[PDB]
């Protein structure tokens, strides 16, 4: 069944710690076998619910949080908080939670008046363990001011859906896709984040990102990477549509990964390259709008190169191979060295087909003994 948090003591006066109250309603709904815990408009302050892994509010199978809409319902940490909080709203560790989520609300990590690494949303089973959370759903949710991550769906979630949401002004990445499977990010916006807008890491595969926008972030707009550990490379991922622009680093970074498809996206005004492939295999850059990047350095619009990790976790030398770059409209900025460029670092088997390279110190520059062009 469904409930109203104020029916459990929750005031929402921007001062009173409404944690236990809210959590009660969640428990009630959990007991009833499911349900939508509601919170009317207003500001609900919450304190840490113990240790970092306990977060603030906890969700269990069949429970969802709903508010008066973004900007209307706001769950804000209490001025003065000071401890690592791995998820202001989360699912239990080691507990395979299914059927839960939230919609139409704003989580404010309130980092200006607090200390400790606070992440907005966190869910998952066991990092490095067998099992996962399932069928999660976040909709029209805003996560801002966290000192850490904005949205942190963690290892491992299956069939996750984050749509029409906004992460901004957080300490790290706006949205993280840490080991997600058969999931979807759709029509989301990450901006003003201290690092990446979108960070796809730790073995994520069969994942689709449709119409997402990342701009004004501290590092790259969207990044797909292996991760600090020698885990499986994220793979078979689709980035369809959207725009990644005016970010400090690249628009899109693909580091140590494979079977990635970037298409129909608008990539501009980024500090470094628009799209940078860093030691990835079978990546496809199709029909994208890559223009006016390299705002902070003399780099190419599209950069292809290999990643040496022979001295890192893997001891492997990631060679970028089989990169298909087709039907793109590449246009440079004053500082754009090339439209497309390979580093002579072993990168091979690049396929340049039907590209409109314009306004750059030079269109194409290939090195691999097998890299080819077909009409340009």
Interacting residues with Ca ion (CB under 5 A): 91, 95, 97, 128, 133
Q: Where is the chain broken, named by the residue before each break, C–N > 2.5 Å?
A: none
3-state helix, strand and coil shares in percent for the chain, rounded to the nearest 5: 5, 50, 45
CB of 228 to Ca ion, least distance (A): 10
- Which CB sits closer to Ca ion, 12 or 171? 171
Q: Per the structure block, which two tokens stand in for 138?
A: 């976040």
CB of 290 to Ca ion, least distance (A): 30
- Which CB sits closer to Ca ion, 170 or 331? 170
- Number of neighbours of residue 50 by Cβ within 10 angstroms: 11
The SS3 of residue 144 is strand
- Which CB sits closer to Ca ion, 135 or 282? 135
- Which CB sits closer to Ca ion, 133 or 152? 133
Q: Per the structure block, which two tokens stand in for 146?
A: 């966290």
CB of 185 to Ca ion, least distance (A): 20
**What is the distance between the alpha carbons of residues 7 and 359, in angstroms, rounded to a whole number?**
63
> Shortest Cβ contact with Ca ion: which residue?
97
CB of 169 to Ca ion, least distance (A): 6
**What is the distance between the alpha carbons of residues 215 and 197, in angstroms, rounded to a whole number?**
7
- Which CB sits closer to Ca ion, 14 or 127? 127
Chain-centroid distance, C-alpha 318: 23
CA distances to 27, 92, 143, 195 from 36, rounded to whole Å, are: 11, 18, 20, 33
Q: Is the dihedral of CA 188, 194, 196, 201 positive or negative?
A: negative
CB of 131 to Ca ion, least distance (A): 9
Burial class (CB in 10 A: 0-12, 13-18, 19+), 80: exposed
Q: Are 296 and 273 in contact (CB under 8 A)?
A: no
- Which CB sits closer to Ca ion, 133 or 173? 133
- Which CB sits closer to Ca ion, 21 or 91? 91
CB of 125 to Ca ion, least distance (A): 6
Q: Are 222 and 200 in contact (CB under 8 A)?
A: yes
CB of 355 to Ca ion, least distance (A): 40
CB of 101 to Ca ion, least distance (A): 12
CB of 92 to Ca ion, least distance (A): 5
CB of 201 to Ca ion, least distance (A): 14
- Which CB sits closer to Ca ion, 231 or 353? 231
66: Cα within 13 Å, side-chain hemisphere: 12
- Which CB sits closer to Ca ion, 99 or 335? 99
Quick check: bond before 114 cis, omega within 30?
no
By C-alpha distance, which of 33, 43, 47, 39 is closest to 78?
47
- Which CB sits closer to Ca ion, 162 or 360? 162
By C-alpha distance, which of 166, 184, 136 is closest to 175?
166
By C-alpha distance, which of 273, 322, 276 is closest to 299?
273
**What is the distance between the alpha carbons of residues 22 and 3, in angstroms, rounded to a whole number?**
10
């Amino acid at each position: 069944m469904d409930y109203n948090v104020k029916d459990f003591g929750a005031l929402g006066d921007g001062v009173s710690d409404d944690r236990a109250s809210i959590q009660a309603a969640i428990d009630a709904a959990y007991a009833a076998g499911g349900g939508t815990v509601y919170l009317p408009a207003g500001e609900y302050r919450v304190s840490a619910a113990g240790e970092p892994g306990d977060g603030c509010l906890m969700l269990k199978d069949g429970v969802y949080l709903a508010g008066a809409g973004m900007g209307e319902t706001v769950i804000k940490l209490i001025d003065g908080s000071d401890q690592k909080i791995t998820g202001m709203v989360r699912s239990a560790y080691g507990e395979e939670t299914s059927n839960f989520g939230m919609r139409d609300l704003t989580l404010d990590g309130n980092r200006d008046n607090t200390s400790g690494k606070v992440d907005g949303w966190f869910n998952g089973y066991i990092p490095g363990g067998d099992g996962a959370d399932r069928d999660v759903t976040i909709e029209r949710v805003e996560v801002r001011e966290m000192s850490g991550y904005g949205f942190d769906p963690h290892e491992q979630t299956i069939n996750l859906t984050i749509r029409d949401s906004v992460a901004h002004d957080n300490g790290l990445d706006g949205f993280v896709a840490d080991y997600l499977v058969d999931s979807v990010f759709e029509n989301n916006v990450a901006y003003a984040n201290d690092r990446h807008g979108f960070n796809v890491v730790t073995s994520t595969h069969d994942f689709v990102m449709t119409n997402n926008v990342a701009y004004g972030n501290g590092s790259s707009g969207l990044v797909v990477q292996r991760g600090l550990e020698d885990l499986a490379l994220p793979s078979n991922i689709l980035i369809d549509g959207g725009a990644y622009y005016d970010n400090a680093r690249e628009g899109v970074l693909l580091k140590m990964t494979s079977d990635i498809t970037l298409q129909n996206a608008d990539i501009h005004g980024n500090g470094s390259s628009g799209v940078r492939v860093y030691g990835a295999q079978d990546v496809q850059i199709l029909d994208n709008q890559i223009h006016d990047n390299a705002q902070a350095a003399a780099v190419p619009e599209v950069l292809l190169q290999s990643f040496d990790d022979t001295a890192g976790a893997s001891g492997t030398y990631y060679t970028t191979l089989n990169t298909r770059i087709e039907g793109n409209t590449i246009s440079g900025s004053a500082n754009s060295t090339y439209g497309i460029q390979e580093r002579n670092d072993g990168t091979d088997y690049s396929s340049l087909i039907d590209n409109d390279i314009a306004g750059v110190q030079q269109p194409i520059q290939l090195y691999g003994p097998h890299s080819t062009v077909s009409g340009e």
